[PDB]
Amino acid sequence: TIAIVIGTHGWAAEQLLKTAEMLLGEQENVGWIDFVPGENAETLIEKYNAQLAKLDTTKGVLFLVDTWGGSPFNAASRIVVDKEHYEVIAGVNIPMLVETLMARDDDPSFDELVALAVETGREGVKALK
């Protein structure tokens, strides 16, 4: 399947994945990194690369990060720059993760998965009242 790597400031990426797996069962072909004060984008690029080495990236790689413009985002941006089937999507949330992981198994095309992740992430933000 298409590889997914989750990155956030701090230690939330591992928990967002755990939450998803609580809903969907354990997932394959998913990696994550943490970002600690003192580290820079170059440290993060290495962390992302070490995770990618363990993933099947033949169909592509989708980096799901916390916010636009942070270090996790900046480092991921440097990796996907001239790579086909590599994308970075900011604002990762549970609806995005769950929908994306579910669709991934039905072997969608890369563009299809990227579009679904953005759409479900946004539609997942909704107030009760």
Place this chain on the structure above:
Amino acid sequence: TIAIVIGTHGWAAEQLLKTAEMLLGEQENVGWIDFVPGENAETLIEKYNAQLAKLDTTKGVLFLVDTWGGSPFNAASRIVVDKEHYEVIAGVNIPMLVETLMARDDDPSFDELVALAVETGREGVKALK
């Protein structure tokens, strides 16, 4: 300020808060709960109530939860039902948390804060390419 309570399946709520505080500094008047397999909505209602007892809820309470329809959402829904200035917003993400926590200090009205949280949460989901 307006109280914020974060709830997700699993143990991600505490980390989303930690991530936010890594960006903004430690926050006051914020609570969180976890949801473990075996627990039901009634357990969660008690957990939310115990957190609220420690918060200043005079200006209102905003429950930020992971997904629409899950237990964390269902329990929060039962609490806000006929309460003024109580709202539940699903799809919590870092952009929503950061913008919401920042605005909260400028003492916005409840409706203003709810609207900002939904708008920033959605606008925060964005693809690079």
